[PDB]
Write an enzyme that holds these catalytic residues in place. Structure first.
Site, PDB file in Angstrom:
ATOM      1  N   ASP A  11     -26.272   8.469 -29.944  1.00  0.00           N
ATOM      2  CA  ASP A  11     -26.513   9.231 -28.729  1.00  0.00           C
ATOM      3  C   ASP A  11     -25.513  10.376 -28.655  1.00  0.00           C
ATOM      4  OD1 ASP A  11     -28.194   9.107 -26.109  1.00  0.00           O
ATOM      5  OD2 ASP A  11     -26.149   9.493 -25.413  1.00  0.00           O
ATOM      6  N   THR A  50     -28.397  12.659 -24.010  1.00  0.00           N
ATOM      7  CA  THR A  50     -27.337  13.614 -24.312  1.00  0.00           C
ATOM      8  C   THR A  50     -27.649  14.402 -25.580  1.00  0.00           C
ATOM      9  OG1 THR A  50     -26.152  11.776 -25.346  1.00  0.00           O
ATOM     10  CG2 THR A  50     -25.568  12.339 -23.087  1.00  0.00           C
ATOM     11  N   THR A  51     -28.110  13.702 -26.620  1.00  0.00           N
ATOM     12  CA  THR A  51     -28.539  14.380 -27.836  1.00  0.00           C
ATOM     13  C   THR A  51     -29.642  15.381 -27.529  1.00  0.00           C
ATOM     14  OG1 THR A  51     -27.998  12.396 -29.120  1.00  0.00           O
ATOM     15  CG2 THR A  51     -29.386  14.050 -30.164  1.00  0.00           C
ATOM     16  N   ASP A  84     -26.431   1.935 -21.301  1.00  0.00           N
ATOM     17  CA  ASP A  84     -27.674   2.693 -21.193  1.00  0.00           C
ATOM     18  C   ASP A  84     -28.680   1.950 -20.323  1.00  0.00           C
ATOM     19  OD1 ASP A  84     -27.217   5.114 -22.497  1.00  0.00           O
ATOM     20  OD2 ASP A  84     -27.661   4.284 -24.476  1.00  0.00           O
TER      21      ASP A  84
END
Lengths: 521, 525, 202, 354
Positions: free
Chosen positions: A56, A89-90, A387
């Site tokens: 991530d 986020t990626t 997450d």
């Protein structure tokens, strides 16, 4: 002939701006394959000197040190996005880099940053307007859809194979730390949902305990280890004669005070423990020291004593056992003796003894049992758990959902492309540009596989036009055109709306750089 | 990406794959030679000029000066395995590396590793059900556990050590507070007594402590001793609140000095009174032991008395003696009765070199006992300690459940055949991985062939063709290599051992093979 | 161990140094091995006469160019071979060759009184040298008619002149004393004057 | 964790760092949220609980330790072995008391600490040689052989630079303008840090500063005046060496050092003869080295030789020693970890053996 300090280095022009865009690229290329249900794992060396494997965005980037401080700026925005909503986020990073690439195609032809920023503002306005125009709700009233969202979230993660399993391990943990005080402000504190990891065990051994699990042990052989209904009290005073804060050195003149002083200290301990013995206890824990006289006294009354505990663990246990921490044994009340634990448990999970406070009523703070094969494995599982809890919380505060995997994003690209032509003005070219930049989203998903991207792209682009077939994405494991109405991929709207706003705004702000100086304090 | 930080190692897909494969190859090839009762014996040198003789995998991993990502993952996983089960940990790394080598030959053939991952997980599941159906129960008896202990003791050490230690361990687990509740060995300590032969190590009922009379004028061997377990200050103490003495003459000096040693003397008089009340004359033993210290004043005051006192013992010593001698530990003198006392039959002292020891034996019903290792070499002592730890681990993993499976390749070849026959069911190129997954367990017996001195394929095909109409429970012999049934000699192994083995190996292989890019960022230029 | 930790932190002991010197020396030793083949075709002027053991291919561009430069060099060097006999000019003209002797041409201005085997052998050696280097102006005469009443205990004195500037001096037999003095040693000394480039053992 | 509670400071970095990142003075982020503002200002209020080389309070140390590396160092010590400093001398009571709090509130895996003299000796790059620990308030002698400080060989002397300044101002009344106030104490210390050197000896220095008056240095200072004939400067070191100046007539510090070396076997003293490094705390001016050299040479047999070593900067010396020992790569053999803490408690710390 000099004027300023010799360490001055000032540069400006389109060249440094282009260097900044290439820095954006050289960040974007590092992460271009960890996206979607089909992912290709990535490992990183911890700057402190350790090892880490993540997939991530920020978690990768937060462990990366850079020069050319613009890379630090994108690291900053990555951390902001991660701690903000906690997913994609990626996605944000790759979107930002590629759409900056697209904007560079527009800057280079003598165009000014200001018109680009105005187009940026209008573009994000239209994005959010149409997203609200397309955002659909969902009733938060079942295990079915919630576990479906968990599956759709962690299918891009490694625990996808245990998705449903993890689902439950998530769901329970959410419902039993959820607390509400004073007729309002329902709270889900992940800190009270303390994470703990234990060596050994199978992956499926993971579960959240309906109580509190702690890494301590009893403080004397006599104190028994099995209690069904624990009469627990929360001590916050050290067990020793109080010193206070006054000065010292009373003057000893006679031979009848020394042993008298020792005896009066012993009797002070006597009274302090007696006021605890009175309320018929079972177990007591404290955050400070314990005296041997006191432990002997509680031994005479068959009470269980525990040495120092962490304050966070202290608060969690206070939530669990329904007792109120007190630092005044001589001011003890019957009000707050702990009751609500299902069983006192003193076992040895591994070779270090633990205390397992199983509870019988609705708790507000858990410890998660975790079993694996290495600290790396448990750390990765941990990250997956954060997450999970973050996305579950977002759904708890958002009854709306938007499909992922590239469907609604193509759809909004199409919608804003249609909206662009209505007005008249060259500003439509940069504006529409971002939608073209948006078309990066499915590419990687296909590019994670190696299929004929052009036909899939054109087909989806067309399909999102007739009869507003704006629900079709790509089945990542197959890399094939599918409809999201059947595959079952859905993500909380908070994450992708945050992605929209964050990427568009960092694009706005990275354009304003033209002049740079170095060598100063 | 050597532009964002000019000093940063960036390796692409094949670079990472190749380095992981090379490291795994080196590790697995090194560790081939460290399993079976006929493995090769390793010598290690620490960073001081100190030598340890090991056959353990985790010791080897954490003694090698190796700085590598995959090697670090291996060290952590094997550390966890040794912590939990602690036997045949070699198998972990062998399986992981062999699967890596297998999947190499097909990813090199263009097979993207994800498909091999699903093939491996399907093979996991099918082998899981096969081992679950072929796992067989047996009531835990003395001889059953003798054979189980012999298994691990031939695994980690040589013949005679196994011969003595099987007996030692099986007697060790007999001593227990509650047969029907889990056992724990912290009540059964290990002490190292480095003056005797390697065959002189044994088990002693009761406890023996390394510290003796801190005020030596005492006796040399006492019998029928009552035990006092106290955790009180028996030495002079200064109150936490500061204060001082004040006087004007030497008479006040004498008075204050004589009144300053009053509280401790009151405590020791309490103790002496309790002793004389519990037993008067007739020389009945009476031992007092305090966790905390004893000042020389009270030390002599009680040494002139026939009482013997011990101070500054291990914290768990008192907690286990609570059960061992049947007494109750005392933490203050506010009330006292003879019930809190423990008892023992014979207590003697023995000197050696610079230190002496206190022996507590002839327990009425030994529920806490002590294992003593006597050997010449400190590294020999440590190796025997590892051996006893492995033996107790194996016997625990046997007794905890009521099921056990044949070892020495038998069930391994069994699920090999089963998965080979089942593979026609599974689909896609993942099928090939299943075959590789099958080849996984094939490493297990053939290294024994390498550890025996036979042609590997010859013995392998003998054992594979040994299969009659029904699945024979046949392993590999340790002297002829001919196929032989496992039940006849009766060497087996625990179920959850291989269970968690498969768990860890599969997951770590997945983690290794899904990687895409290697960085060494975090360098501040 | 501790020493290398010191090394990371401090420099109080020196032990990691000077391991680059032999490295660079060996690098240069391996480097200098290609000079033998770099100029193999660039030194010999008989390689054309060395057919059938020097020819693999002829590009006719740089190699005919090599013939051209070689022939220019040969004509330049053989246009200067005009000498070979040491000559006896008189003192009356002496001013005209101490100064008007050509610029860029070395002059070995030998002065002597015949009769001593020192001067005789030196004259023999220089006359024989004239047979080898016909590009050097030799001068021999009687110093008495060159310098009036010159001290006869200061012979044979070698003079090296060019453009009226003394470049090398060899005064009296104090630097030539001994019948053991030979051909090559005289050639060595005149080379050391900077006029000739040759090689000798000592 | 390379945190080190020094004489009055605590310095937090890492073992591999060239320096600690943060200091311990006993608005970086204080305008964004203010979460750590309160915690750090509260910790700032708490005082230093260590005086004269012995621990005096315990709640405040853990109070400060919690914050100091949970709000800026950003480290979980559960996953880290721990390496702190300690007061120069304490009985085992403080050590085994600190172990309890450390474990019970942090449960860190392993530990090791050492006496500041050992850290200074490591920083100077020595494993041998007795150092003159002339610390503030009180001085001590720690003869170190191979690294471990001998419990039978520590001597403590009550001399302090504060005492030297006080005695100066006890003979500065004889100088006319005395000095006693806070400003006057400060200026006496300032002049001391400017010039209180040693040439050879008292009477010969005073003669050359009064008979010829060539050792005079005029003080042109806003806080100073020309009142020194070269006497008062040299009048600070003299009481540092000769006790009877201060009125507490006893043996010289050199005598204490000589006895603390002679009580040991002569052979090892050779190694102690080897370096014999010094330390500051009360001494900062030259002339000390050669003077004490010859003074103890009077006590040292001519058949054997003596060396004097004194580095100019020794401010982070304990930190340097800690960083070195953290990378010694053999100190883990002496770590005391949970495997023994949960087995024996503090008994092994007491060395029940021998």
């Amino acid at each position: 002939v000099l004027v300023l300090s010799q360490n001055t280095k000032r540069e400006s022009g389109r060249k440094v701006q282009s260097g900044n865009i290439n820095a954006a690229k050289t960040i974007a290329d590092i992460i271009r394959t960890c996206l979607g249900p089909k992912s290709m794992m990535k490992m990183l060396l911890d700057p402190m000197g350790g090892i880490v494997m993540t997939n991530d965005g920020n978690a990768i980037l937060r462990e990366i040190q850079v020069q050319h401080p613009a890379a630090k700026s994108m690291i900053e925005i990555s951390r902001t996005q991660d701690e903000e909503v906690g997913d994609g986020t990626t996605s944000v990073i790759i979107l930002a880099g590629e759409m900056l690439s697209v904007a560079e195609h527009f800057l280079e032809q003598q165009m000014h940053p200001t018109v680009v920023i105005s187009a940026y503002r209008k573009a994000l306005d239209d994005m959010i307007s149409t997203l609200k125009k397309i955002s659909i709700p969902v009733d938060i009233s079942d295990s079915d859809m919630m576990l479906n969202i968990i599956n759709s979230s962690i299918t891009t993660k490694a625990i996808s194979r245990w998705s449903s399993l993890a689902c439950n391990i998530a769901l329970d943990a959410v419902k039993m730390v959820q607390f509400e005080e004073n007729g309002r402000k329902e709270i889900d504190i992940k800190k009270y949902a303390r994470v703990e990891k234990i060596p050994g065990g199978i992956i499926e051994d993971s579960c959240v305990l309906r109580g509190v699990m702690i890494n301590k042990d009893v403080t004397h052989p006599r104190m028994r280890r099995y209690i069904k209904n624990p009469r627990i009290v929360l001590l916050d005073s050290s067990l020793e004669y109080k010193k206070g804060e006054s000065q010292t050195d009373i003057e000893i003149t006679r031979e009848e005070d020394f042993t008298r002083i020792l005896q009066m200290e012993e009797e002070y301990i006597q009274q302090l423990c007696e006021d605890i013995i009175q309320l018929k206890p079972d177990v007591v824990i404290t955050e400070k020291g314990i005296s041997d006289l006191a432990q002997h006294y509680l031994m005479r009354a068959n009470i269980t004593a525990i040495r120092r505990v962490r304050k966070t663990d202290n608060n969690r246990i206070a939530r669990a056992c329904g007792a109120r921490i007190v630092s005044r044994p001589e001011e003890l009340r019957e009000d707050d003796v702990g009751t609500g634990a299902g069983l006192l448990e003193i076992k040895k999970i591994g070779d270090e003894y633990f205390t397992f406070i199983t509870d019988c009523k609705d708790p507000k703070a858990c410890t998660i049992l975790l079993r694996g094969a290495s600290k790396e494995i448990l750390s990765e599982v941990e990250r997956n758990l954060q997450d999970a809890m973050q996305v579950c919380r977002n759904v708890l505060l958002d009854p709306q959902l938007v499909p992922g995997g590239g469907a609604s994003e193509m759809a909004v690209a199409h919608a804003l492309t249609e909206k662009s032509k209505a007005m008249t003005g060259v500003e439509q070219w940069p504006y529409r540009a971002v939608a073209q930049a948006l078309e990066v989203i499915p590419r990687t998903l296909i590019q994670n596989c190696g299929a004929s991207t052009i036909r899939l792209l054109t087909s989806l682009r067309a399909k999102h036009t007739q009869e507003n077939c704006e629900t079709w994405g790509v089945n990542g494991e197959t890399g094939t055109l599918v409809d999201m109405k059947e595959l079952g991929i859905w993500e909380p709207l908070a994450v992708k709306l945050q992605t929209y706003k964050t990427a568009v705004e960092t694009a706005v702000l990275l354009l304003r750089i033209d002049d740079i100086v170095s060598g100063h304090k | 990406v050597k532009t964002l930080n000019p000093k940063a190692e960036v390796a692409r897909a094949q670079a990472a794959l190749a380095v992981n494969i090379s490291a795994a190859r080196g590790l697995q090839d090194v560790l081939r030679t460290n399993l079976g009762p006929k493995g090769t014996m390793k010598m290690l040198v620490s960073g001081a000029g100190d030598i340890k003789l090991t056959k353990d995998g985790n010791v080897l991993l954490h003694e090698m000066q190796i700085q590598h990502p995959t090697a670090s993952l291996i060290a952590k996983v094997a550390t966890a395995q040794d912590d939990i089960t602690g036997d045949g940990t070699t198998s972990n790394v062998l399986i992981i590396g062999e699967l890596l080598k297998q999947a190499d030959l097909y990813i090199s053939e263009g097979l993207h590793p994800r498909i091999i991952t699903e093939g491996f997980e399907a093979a996991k599941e099918k082998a899981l059900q096969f081992l679950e159906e072929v796992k067989v129960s047996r009531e835990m008896d003395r001889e059953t556990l003798i054979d189980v202990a012999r298994t691990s003791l031939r695994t980690k050490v040589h013949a005679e050590l196994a011969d003595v230690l099987t007996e030692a361990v099986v007697d060790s687990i007999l001593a227990i507070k509650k047969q029907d509740e889990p056992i724990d060995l912290f009540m059964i300590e290990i002490m190292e007594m480095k003056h005797k032969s390697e065959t002189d190590t044994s088990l002693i009922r009761g406890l023996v402590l390394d510290h003796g009379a801190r005020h030596p004028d005492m006796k040399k061997r006492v019998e029928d001793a009552y035990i006092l377990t106290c955790n009180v200050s028996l030495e002079y103490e200064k109150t936490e609140v500061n204060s001082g003495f004040f006087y004007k003459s030497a008479e006040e000096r004498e008075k204050l000095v004589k009144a300053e040693r009053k509280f401790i003397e009151d405590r020791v008089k309490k103790i002496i009174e309790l002793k004389r009340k519990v037993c008067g004359d007739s020389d009945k033993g009476f031992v007092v032991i305090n966790q905390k210290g004893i000042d020389p004043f009270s030390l002599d005051a009680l040494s002139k008395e026939g009482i013997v006192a011990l101070r500054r013992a291990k914290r768990r010593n008192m907690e286990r003696l609570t059960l061992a001698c049947g007494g109750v530990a005392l933490n203050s003198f506010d009330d006292l009765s003879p019930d809190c006392l423990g008892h023992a039959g014979l207590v003697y002292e023995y000197t050696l070199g610079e230190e002496k020891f206190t022996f507590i034996e002839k327990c009425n019903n030994p529920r806490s006992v002590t294992l003593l290792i006597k050997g010449p070499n400190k590294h020999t002592l440590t190796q025997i300690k590892d051996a006893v730890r492995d033996g107790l681990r194996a016997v625990k993993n046997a007794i905890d459940d009521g099921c056990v499976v044949p070892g020495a390749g038998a069930v391994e070849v069994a699920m090999a055949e089963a998965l080979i026959k089942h593979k026609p069911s599974v689909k896609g190129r993942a099928q090939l991985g299943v075959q590789a997954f099958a080849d996984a367990l094939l490493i297990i017996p053939k290294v024994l062939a390498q550890n025996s001195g036979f042609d590997l394929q010859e013995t392998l095909v003998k054992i594979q063709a040994e299969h009659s109409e029904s699945g024979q429970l046949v392993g590999v012999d340790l002297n002829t290599g001919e196929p032989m049934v496992a039940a006849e000699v009766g060497v087996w192994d625990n179920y959850c051992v291989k269970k968690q083995l498969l768990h860890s190996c599969t997951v770590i292989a997945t983690n290794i093979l899904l990687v895409d890019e290697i960085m060494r960022a975090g360098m501040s230029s | 161990e501790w020493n290398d930790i010191l090394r990371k932190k401090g420099i109080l002991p020196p032990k990691e140094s000077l391991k680059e010197l032999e490295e660079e020396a060996e690098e240069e030793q391996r480097i200098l091995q290609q000079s033998v083949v770099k100029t193999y075709e660039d030194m010999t002027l008989e390689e054309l006469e060395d057919h059938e053991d020097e020819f693999n291919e002829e590009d006719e561009r740089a190699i005919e160019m090599y013939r051209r430069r070689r022939l220019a060099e040969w004509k330049a060097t053989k246009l200067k071979n005009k000498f070979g006999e040491v000559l006896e000019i008189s003192g009356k003209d002496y001013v005209q060759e101490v100064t008007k002797a050509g610029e860029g041409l070395w002059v070995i201005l030998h002065l002597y009184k015949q009769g001593i085997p020192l001067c005789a052998l030196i004259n023999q050696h220089l006359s024989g040298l004239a047979r080898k280097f016909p590009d050097v102006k030799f001068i021999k005469a009687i110093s008495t008619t060159c310098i009036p009443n010159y001290p006869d205990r200061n012979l044979p004195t070698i003079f090296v002149y060019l453009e009226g500037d003394i470049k090398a001096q060899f005064i009296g037999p104090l630097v030539f004393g001994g019948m053991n003095l030979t051909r090559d040693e005289l050639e060595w000394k005149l080379s050391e004057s900077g006029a000739i480039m040759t090689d000798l053992e000592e | 964790l390379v945190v080190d509670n020094g004489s009055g400071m605590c310095k937090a970095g890492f073992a591999g760092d060239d320096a600690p990142r943060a200091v311990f003075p006993s608005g970086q982020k204080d305008s964004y949220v203010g979460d750590e503002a309160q915690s750090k200002r509260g910790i700032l209020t708490l005082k230093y609980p260590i005086e004269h080389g012995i621990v005096t309070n315990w709640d405040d140390m853990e109070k400060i330790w919690h914050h100091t590396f949970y709000n800026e160092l950003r480290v979980a010590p559960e996953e880290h072995p721990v390496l702190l400093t300690e007061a120069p001398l304490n009985p085992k009571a403080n050590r085994e008391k600190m172990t309890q709090i450390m474990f019970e509130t942090f449960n860190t895996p392993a530990m090791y600490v050492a006496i500041q003299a050992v850290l200074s000796l490591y920083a100077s790059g020595r494993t041998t040689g007795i150092v003159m620990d002339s610390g503030d308030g009180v001085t001590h002698t720690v003869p170190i052989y191979e690294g471990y400080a001998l419990p039978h060989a520590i001597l403590r002397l009550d001399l302090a630079g504060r005492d030297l300044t006080d005695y100066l101002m006890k003979i500065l009344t004889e100088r006319g303008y005395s000095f006693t106030t806070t400003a006057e104490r400060e200026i006496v210390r300032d002049i001391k840090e400017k010039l209180c050197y040693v040439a050879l000896d008292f009477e010969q220095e005073m003669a050359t500063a009064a008979s010829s008056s060539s050792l005079e240095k005029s003080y042109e200072l806003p806080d100073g005046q020309v009142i020194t004939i070269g006497n008062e400067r040299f009048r600070c070191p003299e009481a540092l060496f000769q006790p009877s100046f201060l009125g507490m007539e006893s043996c010289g510090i050199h005598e204490t050092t000589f006895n603390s070396i002679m009580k040991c076997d002569v052979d090892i003293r050779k190694d102690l003869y080897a370096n014999t490094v010094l330390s500051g705390g009360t001494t900062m001016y030259p002339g000390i080295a050669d003077r004490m050299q010859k003074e103890i040479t009077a006590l040292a047999p001519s058949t054997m030789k003596i060396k004097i070593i004194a580095p100019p900067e020794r401010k982070y010396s304990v930190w340097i020693g800690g960083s070195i020992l953290a990378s010694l790569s053999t100190f883990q053999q002496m770590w005391i970890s949970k495997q023994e803490y949960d087995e024996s408690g503090p008994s092994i710390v007491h060395r029940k053996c021998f």
